[model samples]
Target: LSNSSKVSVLISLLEKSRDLDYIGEAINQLEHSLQCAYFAQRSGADNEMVLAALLHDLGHYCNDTSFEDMGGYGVWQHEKVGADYLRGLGFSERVACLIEGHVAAKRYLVSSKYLKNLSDASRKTLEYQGGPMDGERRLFEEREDFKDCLKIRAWDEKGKQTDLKVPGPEHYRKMMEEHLSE
Candidate 1:
């Protein structure tokens, strides 16, 4: 499919999943995505980074998995699922890797003071996703690509606020279109 067509399909999928609650958070999946994207855009991240933020949790919807109820220990990993989906759609490897590594980024953050800032739901989910990795895995996470994941992870945490006003998915269509693989 063409990039525009892929984006259209993605938007449709997002719309269909709009009513689903985001894990244990108050906001639904659509709202969470929009908020993440909004945070990235406001932070002046590039198009791919903003797109990564917007679609980071997309795996939760794509597989019909009840991630909210899994308590963060779902058999299906949303980070991988979402990243693989985007890769199949021809998104950049940087974007795909960021999505894939976001869960690990959370685990990495646990070693720092930011762990206290995680919401109740996030804390619970973190347990299921594995608290953190050590040794070589820790070394790997320290690389540059994971830095983008860290940024996305930060927005993911902040995106849960129900009162936040964020631009809708339509606001990102142009950026998505521009970045879409021809």
Candidate 2:
């Protein structure tokens, strides 16, 4: 099966399992990821970066990486798991790097005290775990693809709401193929 097919299967499984109370968070996360991709594409961002934004939170679907469990630290720091999953699937390495660096895009906000306050769990998690991010920030800052990562972060934050104008997967695939002249 193709990489896209594998991703689709995961989506199908998540969609089918959304009725379960525990899966609700994953469902919401998936929706946000998709919307982020859609918005990123609509905003004329690079396709790879948009795709990276979409897959960034996929780790939550796998292990015990729930945002609720991370004591707030997990809310936006689960990119490592998702990046690892994509790399394991033999997807593009650039996409994997983008996913891995996504969390650090928010590090500046967290460090500069520009972001909003975390919930009790989030606060506790950061206090114990050393904030929303630590070494990831320096790594992210040093990446050559830092521009793409920051753009993905912008799309991610703005894509929280649903929009009818955003194209779905089929459209995205077509656009990608056409853009790549495949």
Candidate 3:
């Protein structure tokens, strides 16, 4: 298992996971991930953050066979799954944290009165992920990765467009390969 193949490993995972639904959203998983990457890249994110946007949902791919095995551990349990898996694959902490903390960012968004913005499909998972952090947002805002975390979550939310065309895994080769070469 040469480290050089990790980028390939991720692409294959993404390819295999392409048709999976994005938590029952209109768009499928691969499209959502790609859109997130496009959004991240267009928004001036660095390589890791862009990769984080793309691979943010890898946990779902890892668990799809037994999603009935959600383990009933509440929603976005996959967030930590994704983060840890990325870390194990040599993704840096910042990228890994972008995956893990995204749900918290959602909670943060909800607490900020952004709750109304979520569609039921998106909103229903909130309570299980710790509801909204109504009071602690001030502190949550002070963290170093706060902005990037929120950016990833925002891109996640925005990526659900069935009619949109986005650069696929091909477009990310440079970014992903660079991360591995580091």
Best by lDDT: 1
Residue 178, model 3: lDDT of 75
Candidate 3 residue 146 C-alpha distance from true site, Å? 0.8
CA lDDT, every model vs. true structure:
0.80, 0.59, 0.78
Considering every candidate listed, which one attains the maximal TM-score? 1
Q: What would the per-residue lDDT of candidate 1 be over residues 75-152, giving only the tens digit for each residue?
A: 267888999998888888888888998888888877644767887776777766767565736675668886777888
Q: For candidate 3, write residues 70-100 as lDDT tens digits.
A: 3332234778888888788787888888888
Q: Which runs in model 2 stand beyond 4 Å of their true positions?
A: 13-27, 64-68, 72-77, 117-129, 132-139, 162-165, 173-182
Clashes of 1: 0
Candidate 2 — what's its lDDT?
0.59
Per-residue lDDT of candidate 2, residues 48-99 (tens digit): 7777876776665555545565643344346777788766656578888888
> What TM value does model 2 have?
0.70
Q: lDDT at 89 for candidate 1?
A: 80
